[PDB]
Curated annotation (Swiss-Prot):
One MF annotation (Gene Ontology) recorded for this entry: heme binding
Enzyme Commission code: 1.14.15.1
Function text: Involved in a camphor oxidation system.
A GO-annotated cellular component: cytoplasm
Name of the gene: camC
Full protein name: Camphor 5-monooxygenase
GO biological process: (+)-camphor catabolic process
Listed pathway(s): Terpene metabolism; (R)-camphor degradation
Oxidoreductase keyword on record: yes
Amino acid sequence: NLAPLPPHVPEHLVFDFDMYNPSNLSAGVQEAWAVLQESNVPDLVWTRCNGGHWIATRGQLIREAYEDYRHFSSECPWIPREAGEAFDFIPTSMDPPEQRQFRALANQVVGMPVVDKLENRIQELACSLIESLRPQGQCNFTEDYAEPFPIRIFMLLAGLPEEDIPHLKYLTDQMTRPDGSMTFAEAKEALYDYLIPIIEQRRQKPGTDAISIVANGQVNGRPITSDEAKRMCGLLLLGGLDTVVNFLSFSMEFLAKSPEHRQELIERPERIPAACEELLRRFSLVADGRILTSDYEFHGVQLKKGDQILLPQMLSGLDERENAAPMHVDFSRQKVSHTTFGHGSHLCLGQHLARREIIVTLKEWLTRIPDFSIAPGAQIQHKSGIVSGVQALPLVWDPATTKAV
Ligand code: HEM
Ligand SMILES: CC1=CC[C@@H]2C[C@H]1C2(C)C
Ligand SMILES: [K+]
């Protein structure tokens, strides 16, 4: 159940939060983690769950720890420990200075520039899917939109056949939210097995997909190795199949239950980008961490070299010390403060692709299906993990209230 409290961890700082099955899941995953920001929970606690680790509960500490890579290394960023030890993805598993040369290469295959290209391809698919769904008056949002819209765009960017989705998506999820049929190590090895012949094939005969660009690129001037390309592409694949997919679902679940929120977007489409940020904060969903490089006193707490500390990017924006009424969605919110795309030298390279997907989704869905609700009676279930998400989201609406556009 719980790991024996290490001698150096204060008994009064213990708070056994379980990141893969938080107590409050029924109330909502963001709410379940929010329990860590309650009146008498300190800024830093120790949970004996998942092997034992620190958890920074407030954005101030979260931001600081992410900026201080000397003490909090990305070397072992995943929890549980075994998983963090096998996590060798590039460039997320490296700290500056060595990280940059690779981060630059990755920025080349998913950055703004690549996204402006993809713009029309992304609108076409969003419309394509929504219009095909419009007349039915119902859908399984997670499988009929949330998953194929972002994944197909990534599989297109990566130059990979769509039939590979079921397999890759299953591996990916075992890494963020393991159902237990596979360890992080097994999921990664299969992802590395998938790529290897594809990376060797595109190095032998260069194309113009994100994969070829990576296997054939350079780092600070020198040629990338096969193995280095593999570690980077696995990360890219990981960032493309399980982030926006889940986020679209928290956003649309909320919109289906907020008629007033929907109207505002119908009435004033010019605020969709702003709503996109507010939702990015409200339904933040990533939580990874770092490992202590040496013994280090942090905010009055003694951390030992080797201790893992989970720094929930999700919690910053939900922190009342960052945004008043944090649990409240307000598209007109003055200063939207958050760390949903991370913080420090590891800032999300895919955020520009993420915002673009989210915004076109908001624009095109509302423009064709302005009124919809959650299937009557449905009991929505979230799952918590490195990346939290929605199990299923049944949606219904009346086709008479829609419009081809
Ligand atoms: C709503 C969507 C997304 C969210 C909230 C998100 C969140 C994050 C977070 C929190 C990190 C930092 C991890 C750390 O510091 O350990 C990160 C890194 C990264 N993400 Fe995103 N991500 C999203 C979408 C994407 C997409 C679509 C891609 C590309 C296909 C992507 C690619 C990356 C990469 C390559 C990194 C690594 C940066 C580095 O390690 O320097 N992400 N992301
Ligand atoms: C967007 C992402 C790609 C890979 C893992 C999931 C995040 C990360 C925590 C860095
Ligand atoms: K590692």
